[model samples]
Target: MSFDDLHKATERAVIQAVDQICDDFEVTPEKLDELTAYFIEQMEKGLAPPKGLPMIPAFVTGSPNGTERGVLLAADLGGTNFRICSVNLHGDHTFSMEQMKSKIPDDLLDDENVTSDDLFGFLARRTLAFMKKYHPDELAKGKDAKPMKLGFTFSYPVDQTSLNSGTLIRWTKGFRIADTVGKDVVQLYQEQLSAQGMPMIKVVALTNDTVGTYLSHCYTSDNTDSMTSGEISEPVIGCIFGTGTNGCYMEEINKITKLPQELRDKLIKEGKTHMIINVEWGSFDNELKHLPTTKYDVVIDQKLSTNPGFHLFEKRVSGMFLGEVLRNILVDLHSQGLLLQQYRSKEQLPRHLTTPFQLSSEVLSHIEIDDSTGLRETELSLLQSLRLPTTPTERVQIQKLVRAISRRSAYLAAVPLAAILIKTNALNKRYHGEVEIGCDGSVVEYYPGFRSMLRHALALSPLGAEGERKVHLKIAKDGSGVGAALCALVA
Candidate 1:
């Protein structure tokens, strides 16, 4: 076995996956139209969960749409990073600000030693520290009277009752803070702030990363129309694609059937709960069929998750599993005598350091070559980097296999997204009017041609107008941070 053998085998797998995906799910032009309608219907259903009409209202009232003084602080707690920023909201929803970021401390991530109080206190202290360093004048103002308001962008699944309060759902994205799982996060923050003898800064509004992004986009767009008397408005969907994925959308409460009588009573009693509904699409696994999984997917599952049965959808499409999938496939090829002899040993071809993107890159590079010799060049580069040896032929084989597997992944990932659009009836209704699907994720952003494949799949269905009219799929920039700030202003 050699590099060429590995590349060839991987390529065959990728091609076969792609071909099979197309054969099984590819839509005709006529079906595309129906799919478009179905996609929107499904999206509506999923986001507006008919069975649980408990909408997490988006806080639009306190929105610093115009009137606010002093610099406000905004913090986003994402899966990977804790980002903090300060902003001076202007007369027309404009902001001049300074921003900073820090990694979620490894010590805090350990559930055994870290308590909920410690976790919330660390965030409060870090936020206060950021304000003291960046906006000392604002810190002084806080000491004299009340502190500046804070917009906290918490990226987790939560059940919200108002703009400022929500009960936390179970933690995801490697978070294991057991105590915080079912508590109101805003109250948690409030208690933490009081314990630190920190000034009472209004939590103002709480929102998901996607909602923050949407609010930012809307506010910025509104600012663009300051000179005109008429305000331009549009519906925006905020999506976060990172360690995990989720989305938010505006919906009318009357349409939601899932709301139990007690919950409905609460909403009615509270009055006008314009919620930011969290469509935890990552948990969508109703059909429980057609996952396009391989042996590698299973191994990654068994090793990484304590609860693998859940988030099955995310396992196939997210960054966490993509690299492992490639590693497993390559290892299998080595065992089957399809890879270079240097990679034959399990210890030598371990999955620890190798990533999915790295494998994809090697395969892509090999495929670009004019001859087997060129593939050998690609193989040498990868092998040297991994401290493995490969021959010219083995390099080509590895390239082919990598390409095939990646392509298959791209194709398979598109199915659920397409299905969501169809279920929502968004694609079918002409009046839905140029709906934009906001996407964010490293894999969606970095993986070559992955977005294109997604677009192609959408186009094949009726969602994108069956190739007649196009639905916009926009990559929102810094959506979470901005959306959080907007949520605070609205609150």
Candidate 2:
């Protein structure tokens, strides 16, 4: 097909995908209520742990009861790099902190595309290096002391047995470290630290960014004398909607009935399933039967390590792929003769022209300020990004198209979250307490209307009016960092 035809076809695909997603996952009032009930039931049964795996303890002792004093070394290992920071935990959990971030060198990323011993070793060494540079005095003062306690923020799927230890279940979000699979990451790091002659810094808490966010909120907000009595009593839900998305909340251990006996036995042997649970909602689409997808999605999916079906919810909503969704549409439109006069040249438009960040930038540009007289600005941005020429009209058309697609995406992103809240009676039927869902992430925070759209969707649900009055959705600042520190204080 010609470039114009191709572009049109892709645009059609995106539209179709959006409609399909709305049809399949969008629940009517009744269906929403039913799904909410089901979700709560499953949560109570313990079937909804973030990774769909049993909640393993991280062995992070002295948590939730530990005193807040001394310096805490925190590290966040996520999709791109390893971030290290030091916090002086004051008697009141407020103190000075400093941090350093570095990319995980490609060499340590594993040859088979999985985490290996070397990778763990490298991370430990980096942690040691950071300590030696920034907190050398603390390290030296504690020569006989165990390494200063650390809150390790591992942004991946892990089965933990305590705050300090957890096994790797499988990789997600572009991670494919085959070597680290099925092993306790904490132990791996511990071994590496020991070999390096680095004082063993006990991992007082191990958790995902979402959990850290929640903990941080509780610590900071609870201590503020301004908190209303009702707000103090309400439970907190933490959510991250960045490159990918996931959420977590406090839960009663006795209510987790869905945990398999085998896993339960393991936890029992280890001893603990406390008040927190990670809802790896990003991986919620196991069946993949109902997710809204298009040709581009299929292409992206086929390229993933797990393949076929995985992270369907995340692929649809997260910042990592949402822009790609818009790109697919624009490219299709360009091929359909819809922009003949605008983008006359075929050599300029390449398939990969639509990077995720570009998509986000385009949407932001269009919504905030699009002066593309005839699509000139939009066309120029795409063409320049891809080195192509386009008429003003084509630029405007593409701009409008992206805005529509982004709106749809933002709307759909709210479904599962609202579904979870309703399902848990966290919104409806529960006490009339105002629930605060703490959100953190680039898309959720940067995208102009994202939060409002999500709230709008919630307002349209069965829990619509009543739930709206009872729950308030707010974004948390430095959620992960604060939460990590709180994890240490709790320990």
Candidate 3:
């Protein structure tokens, strides 16, 4: 296939391709509404075994209501970056934060040579440095300051047994720490902190990023009388759309029928009955029934090294996979003599360094931001990233393809949030006020029209109401930032 020869797609191919893409991949309001219903069913079913997904609950029940006042410490360890923050909450809805981020060293990520002491020791070392720098008086040997609480926001999955402790579930997102999987992460972290001579640090609250994000808003919005006009006072959900995707919401203890009896009894005894549940809802449609499929999806399955049957919903919608999906489509078109020539080398070396997903998700953002009449940036990106010099017609094709895929992703992302609202009876019942969704992550936060597309899908779906007070999405600050701090107070 030659780029010059393929000035335009044949009329037959273009017509058929459009239909194939839309009919299978694109969703209607009806389809989304149907999926939302099924999603609600799955959420309920996931609480018990034999369900398709892991709708696990975070043992932490409290959300900040803006009145929480304390000097707290929080650290969030994620796949790519690790951040620690010092927060001082003023009794009002006002607060000040000092936070810093550091890249996790590669040696710690390797399971073969890594130990719990080394990993948690690194966390303690960072905190000691922070304390030494900012609050030197408090750290001066025996100098006494008010007791400060601490929280940890671990992005990976965990099995919680109490408010402050949880064992690590199987690691994901490039983590393969062999010995850490079945151990209590909180205890390991605490022991390391104490070993570092940071005895005053009390690791009181532990949570996932999703729950932390939701609790950040809960703490900030819980005291509505102190909230100003136009602020979200009732936060219903914490959603993420970047890196990997997940959400968490507050659920009544009684509603979670499959909750462990010991946990239920403890919470009931303490009257801390409600809890924030980390709904790892990314693996939607694990059974594969009614999930939209396309030629690109089918083809990518063949390309993957591992067997089929995983992250079906995430692959179709999340930022981590959408660009790869686009790349696969381009490869498919090239193979069919539609886009560009097959794999080649210049001077006996592969000219293009990028592969599989040369067009990264950031490239999608760049393409969207390009306001050129001729798609100048996109054309340049094609040449450098995909090693393809393009024409105007080809650029248009790329734009259409990207838009269709992105719109689909945004709409699909909305269904779960909308479904949560419906499941909570926030939609059917006439609420006295609006239900606020605290959304944090790149996709929902700054992906151009993603928020709008999600809103449009929700507005038109059958579950959408024709009445007053709908779902309001607030692009919240990083949940792990203050969420851990607030968790310290709440727990």
Clashes of 3: 6
Q: Candidate 1 residues 15-124, lDDT tens each?
A: 56434533442334464344334435455554454322123445443222344445666777766788787777675656686787877877667655467787788877
Candidate 1 deviant stretches above 4 angstroms: 1-71, 78-82, 89-95, 100-118, 143-147, 156-158, 169-183, 194-200, 217-235, 260-275, 303-306, 341-384, 389-397, 416-432, 464-469
**Which of the predicted structures, 1 or 3, would earn the higher lDDT when compared with the native?**
3
Residue 428 error for model 1, in Å? 9.0
Off by over 4 Å in 2: 1-70, 90-94, 102-121, 169-183, 194-200, 222-235, 258-274, 294-307, 340-400, 426-432, 477-480
TM-score of 1: 0.72
Which one is best on TM-score?
A: 3
Best by lDDT: 3
Model 2 superposed RMSD (Cα)? 6.2
User: Residues 1-491, candidate 2, lDDT per residue (tens digit)?
Assistant: 99888767855664554455435433355644554444444444445444333333333222231235666767778777888777775656356778878787776554456446767777877877887787666457544554566777887777776666777787776457666777888778777766665665776678877777766655444432234444533445667886777777755444555445675566556655545667766655455534455566777667632536666767767676666655665565556544433555554554445343345454443343455345365546644564445554345455555555555556556655666566556644345456667678888888767777677667766667645656666666665566676676666
lDDT of each: 0.58, 0.61, 0.72
How well does each candidate superpose onto the true structure, as a TM-score? 0.72, 0.74, 0.86
Best-to-worst order by lDDT is 3, 2, 1
Q: How far in Å is the alpha carbon of 399 misplaced in model 2?
A: 4.2
lDDT of 3 by residue, 184-225 (tens): 988888888777766777889888778878877765563452
